[PDB]
DNA sequence: GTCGG
DNA sequence: GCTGATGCGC
DNA sequence: CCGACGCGCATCAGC
């Protein structure tokens, strides 16, 4: 965190462009600039120094100069003081409320946790669950707990069918000490790019996790994707564990590695690897790696039996999940 | 907001 | 009541 | 200096 002051500012700037401006690309630009600086091994002493890095342009170089000189950023003082921006920014902290709904609630004078309680009948099911766990969802999950959660999920899955294969990905797979949520990748032999589909592969597992009361609520659920809420077992009287966000994604077994690579991240890493693979005549998504034709049309899915295979296809030195946290 | 074209 | 349109979070 | 940088699910506006 040699440049924690700078990256903190680029992030808050990023989130403003995301929630308020609804400018997803400026959002990206800011996270990208904060991502390269976070990887910069020297304490930045001036914007010009920062400007040398790809992602850090003119406007940001200046903001850095100001931050380095003033200890703060006026543009951000204004943002935190502006009632509209601050309310919208706050509302998006509730799961289920994105930029659009937050901005609408605000146009109607709904801008605080209290107003949501008051105007609850206006919220959808997902948003209601979001408000109910507003405090719990913002809590980081200690790896120590991510481990207990892993065992419960892996165990319950094996209890359903011994051939299932759940793999906890995301920041956890990256070896992080604490995580935002818990992401689980699932596969079964009876489900591949063909198989004429298998009904309820994800259901059964989700249903079992509910049977042992690990999963407490559902935000959205489909045949391949599940977003919900869970909670470690509570002693028998003592303090209850915080409710946590869990995501389960069922992917075809013959696409497992491309899937673990994606759901493992990091998010900026994926954006980085994708762009690279595209400079190398390949196109990568969360399911397959395809070669790009002389024209630009993606050929068929190359074979993949390991994350490294994907690194090889794009002339990139394989990096362990611990070195992808960009 | 950035940078390759 | 249906569905194209859009929002949401990953 | 211009302009590229999406998916599986839920909901509801416009019929
Ligand atoms: N828009 C996007 N573009 C590219 N990749 C994206 C993505 N959204 C999610 N991903 C992928 C990579 C993340 O590691 C992975 C998990 O998505 P996630 O939102 O759970 C964040 P994670 O990286 O696990 O850290 P944490 O904050 O939860 O502790 O999903
Ligand atoms: Mn150096
Ligand atoms: Mn009020
Ligand atoms: Mn995660
Ligand atoms: Mn997730
Ligand atoms: Mn019960
Ligand atoms: Mn509870
Ligand atoms: Mn490259
Ligand atoms: Mn432009
Ligand atoms: Na630069
Ligand atoms: Na939100
Ligand atoms: Na539809």
From CA A91, how far away is CA A25, in angstroms rounded? 21
Q: Based on the domain organization, do A146 and A128 belong to the same domain?
A: no
From CA A137, how far away is CA A196, in angstroms rounded? 37
Of the candidates A78, A79, A36, A73, the residue with the CA atom closest to the CA atom of residue A57: A36
Q: Which nucleotide is nearest to A23 (CA to C1')?
A: B1
**Domain holding A130: CATH number?**
1.10.150.20
- Whether ligand 1 lies within 6 angstroms of the CB of A137 is answered as no
Of the candidates A324, A215, A204, the residue with the CA atom closest to the CA atom of residue A263: A324
Question: What six digits make up the tokens of A49?
Answer: 């120094």
Instruction: Please count the residues of chain A.
Output: 326
Question: CB neighbours (10 Å) of residue A32?
Answer: 20
Pairing of β A244-250 and β A182-186: parallel
Q: Based on the domain organization, do A44 and A126 belong to the same domain?
A: no
Question: What six digits make up the tokens of A13?
Answer: 């700037």
Which residue's alpha carbon is at the smallest distance from atom 11 of ligand 1? A263
Cβ atoms A54, A36 nearer than 8 A:
yes
CA of A65 to C1' of C8 (A): 36
- CA–centroid distance for A56 within its chain: 23
Cβ atoms A312, A280 nearer than 8 A:
no
Structural domain harbouring A186? 140-262
Q: Based on the domain organization, do A98 and A195 belong to the same domain?
A: no
CA of A26 to C1' of D5 (A): 10
Last residue of a domain, one of A139, A167, A183: A139
- Whether ligand 1 lies within 6 angstroms of the CB of A266 is answered as yes
Reported as half-sphere exposure (CB side, CA atoms, 13 A), residue A293 has a value of 6
Cβ atoms A76, A13 nearer than 8 A:
yes
Q: Which nucleotide is nearest to A51 (CA to C1')?
A: B2
Q: Based on the domain organization, do A57 and A90 belong to the same domain?
A: no
Work out the angle at residue A197's Cα, subtended by the Cα atoms of residues A254 and A228, and round it to the nearest 5 degrees.
85
Residues whose CB is less than 8 angstroms from the CB of residue A309 and which lie 6 or more positions away in sequence, other chains included: A257, A303
Instruction: Considering only CA atoms, name the residue closest to the C1' of nucleotide D3.
Output: A25
Cβ atoms A247, A215 nearer than 8 A:
no
Last residue of a domain, one of A240, A262, A284: A262
Cβ atoms A284, A271 nearer than 8 A:
no
Q: Based on the domain organization, do A245 and A159 belong to the same domain?
A: yes
User: At residue A2, what are phi and psi to the nearest 5 degrees?
Assistant: -65, -30
From CA A193, how far away is CA A303, in angstroms rounded? 13
Catalytic residues of A: 63
Q: Based on the domain organization, do A17 and A58 belong to the same domain?
A: yes
**Domain holding A267: CATH number?**
3.30.210.10
- CA–centroid distance for A22 within its chain: 18
Experimental approach taken:
X-ray
- Find the A130 Cα to ligand 6 centroid distance in Å: 22
Q: Based on the domain organization, do A93 and A166 belong to the same domain?
A: no
Phi-psi region of A293 (alpha: psi -120 to 50; beta: other; left: phi over 0): beta
Q: Based on the domain organization, do A4 and A70 belong to the same domain?
A: yes
HEC assignment per residue over chain A: CCCHHHHHHHHHHHHHHHHCCCCHHHHHHHHHHHHHHHCCCCCCCCHHHHHCCCCCCHHHHHHHHHHHHHCCCHHHHHHHHCHHHHHHHHHCCCCCCCHHHHHHHHHCCCCCHHHHHHCHHHCCHHHHHHHHCHHHHCCCEEHHHHHHHHHHHHHHHHHHCCCCCCEECHHHHCCCCEECCEEEEECCCCCCCCCCCCCCHHHHHHHHHHHCCCEEEEEEECCCEEEEEECCCCCCCCCCCCCEEEEEEECCHHHHHHHHHHHHCCHHHHHHHHHHHHHCCEEECCCCEEEECCCCCECCCCCCCCHHHHHHHCCCCCCCHHHCCC
- Whether ligand 1 lies within 6 angstroms of the CB of A265 is answered as yes
Cβ atoms A128, A217 nearer than 8 A:
no
Residues whose CB is less than 8 angstroms from the CB of residue A62 and which lie 6 or more positions away in sequence, other chains included: A47
Number of domains forming the structure of chain A: 4
- Find the A313 Cα to ligand 9 centroid distance in Å: 34
From CA A218, how far away is CA A215, in angstroms rounded? 8
Question: What six digits make up the tokens of A9?
Answer: 């500012």
Mutate to test the pocket of ligand 1, among A140, A142, A171 (most ligand atoms within 8 A of CB): A171
Q: Would the Cβ of A92 be found within 7 angstroms of any atom in strand C?
A: yes
User: Would you tell me the crossing angle of helices A99-107 and A83-91 to the nearest 10 degrees?
Assistant: 130
Q: Based on the domain organization, do A176 and A203 belong to the same domain?
A: yes
Q: Based on the domain organization, do A155 and A254 belong to the same domain?
A: yes
> Residue for token digits 């040699």?
A2
Pairing of β A225-230 and β A289-291: unpaired
Last residue of a domain, one of A113, A139, A165: A139
From CA A279, how far away is CA A291, in angstroms rounded? 11
Work out the angle at residue A303's Cα, subtended by the Cα atoms of residues A302 and A307, and round it to the nearest 5 degrees.
105
Q: Based on the domain organization, do A230 and A156 belong to the same domain?
A: yes
Q: Residues with beta carbon < 5 A to ion ligand 11?
A: A 92, 97
Task: Tell me the structure's resolution in angstroms, rounded to a single decimal.
Answer: 2.6
Mutate to test the pocket of ligand 1, among A141, A142, A143, A183 (most ligand atoms within 8 A of CB): A183
**Domain holding A217: CATH number?**
3.30.460.10
- Find the A40 Cα to ligand 2 centroid distance in Å: 8
Q: Based on the domain organization, do A251 and A308 belong to the same domain?
A: no
């Amino acid at each position: 965190t040699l440049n924690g002051g700078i990256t903190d500012m680029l992030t808050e700037l990023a989130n403003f462009e995301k929630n308020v401006s609804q400018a997803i690309h400026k959002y990206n630009a800011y996270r990208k600039a904060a991502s390269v600086i976070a990887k910069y091994p020297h304490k930045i002493k001036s914007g010009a120094e920062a400007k040398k890095l790809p992602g850090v342009g003119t406007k940001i170089a200046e903001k850095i100069d100001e931050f380095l000189a003033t200890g703060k950023l006026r543009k951000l003082e204004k943002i935190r003081q502006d009632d509209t921006s601050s309310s919208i920014n706050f509302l998006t902290r509730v799961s289920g409320i994105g930029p659009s709904a937050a901005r609408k609630f605000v146009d109607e004078g709904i801008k605080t946790l209290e107003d949501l309680r008051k105007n609850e009948d206006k919220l959808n099911h997902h948003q209601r669950i979001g408000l109910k766990y507003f405090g719990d969802f913002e809590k980081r999950i200690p790896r120590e707990e991510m481990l207990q959660m892993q065992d419960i999920v892996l165990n319950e899955v094996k209890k359903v069918d011994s051939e299932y294969i759940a793999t906890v990905c995301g920041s956890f797979r990256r070896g992080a000490e604490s995580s935002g949520d818990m992401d689980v990748l699932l596969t079964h032999p009876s489900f591949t790019s063909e198989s004429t589909k298998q009904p309820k592969l994800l259901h059964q597992v989700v249903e079992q996790l509910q049977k042992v009361h690990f999963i407490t609520d559902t935000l959205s659920k489909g045949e391949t994707k599940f977003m919900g809420v869970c909670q470690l077992p509570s002693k028998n009287d003592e303090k209850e564990y915080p409710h946590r966000r869990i995501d389960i994604r069922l992917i075809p077994k013959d696409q497992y590695y491309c899937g673990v690579l994606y759901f493992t991240g990091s998010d900026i890493f994926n954006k980085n690897m994708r762009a690279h693979a595209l400079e190398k005549g390949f196109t990568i998504n969360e399911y397959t790696i395809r070669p790009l034709g002389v024209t630009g049309v993606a050929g068929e899915p190359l074979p993949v039996d390991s994350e490294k295979d994907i690194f090889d296809y794009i002339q990139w030195k394989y990096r362990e999940p611990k070195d992808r946290s960009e």
